[PDB]
Design a protein around this ligand. Structure first.
Ligand SMILES: O=C(O)c1sc(Cc2ccccc2)nc1-c1ccccc1
Length: 188
């Protein structure tokens, strides 16, 4: 076939009941995640090729960056709760990987403050049980598929994208091959 298990995607031995339709995992410590966000815009390009209104979900993971990696999963929980993902993703990625000015939870907080989130509303979210729960939910989603690598995308809790099965001679072809594969997988 044109699409084959083992090539553009792999199939989960343990299908995940009730997982989100399009599920991405990333780490602000992940170098290809940096690319996926800044260079490739994987998410937007998948969204343009999916039917309107369908849910894409994106979660942070703990297993890179030790203490700070976990701080970052909590910060991502804060961004989701406040709905400011678009405001802090680039500055968080660059703070960790480009300028390397993010070395503590306080530095992470600075990024939100600079992006115009009020100090009071940051700290309140950071400390909230709503956020504790959003941290739990990110961990659980990752756990359900024994995630050991990012960036990762899962479709309908069954299928996992295999980016290394795709052309990397050309960034634009990669992206469209990636997006087209997600579309195909969602139509199963
Ligand atoms: O498999 C690889 O080497 C590449 S290439 C890439 C971005 C890109 C595309 C086209 C041209 C230049 C760069 N992401 C990956 C990747 C690797 C492991 C897991 C997930 C993704």
């Amino acid at each position: 076939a044109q699409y084959e298990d083992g090539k553009q995607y792999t199939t989960l031995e343990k299908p995940v009941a009730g997982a989100p339709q399009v599920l991405e995992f990333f780490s602000f410590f992940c170098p290809h995640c940096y690319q996926f966000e800044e260079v490739l815009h994987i998410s937007d390009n998948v969204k343009k090729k999916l039917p309107e209104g369908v849910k894409m979900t994106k979660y942070h993971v703990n297993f890179m960056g030790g203490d700070l990696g976990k701080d970052l999963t909590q910060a991502w929980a804060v961004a989701m709760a406040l709905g400011v993902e678009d405001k802090v993703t680039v500055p968080l990625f660059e703070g960790v990987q480009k300028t390397q000015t993010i070395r503590s939870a306080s530095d992470i907080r600075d990024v939100f403050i600079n992006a115009g989130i009020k100090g009071e509303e940051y700290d309140a979210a950071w400390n909230s049980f709503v956020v504790k729960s959003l941290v739990a939910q990110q961990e659980k989603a990752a756990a359900d598929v024994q995630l050991r690598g990012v960036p990762a995308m899962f479709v309908n809790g069954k299928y996992q994208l295999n980016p290394q099965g795709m052309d990397t001679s050309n960034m634009d072809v990669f992206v469209q091959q990636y997006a087209d594969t997600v579309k195909y997988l969602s139509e199963k």
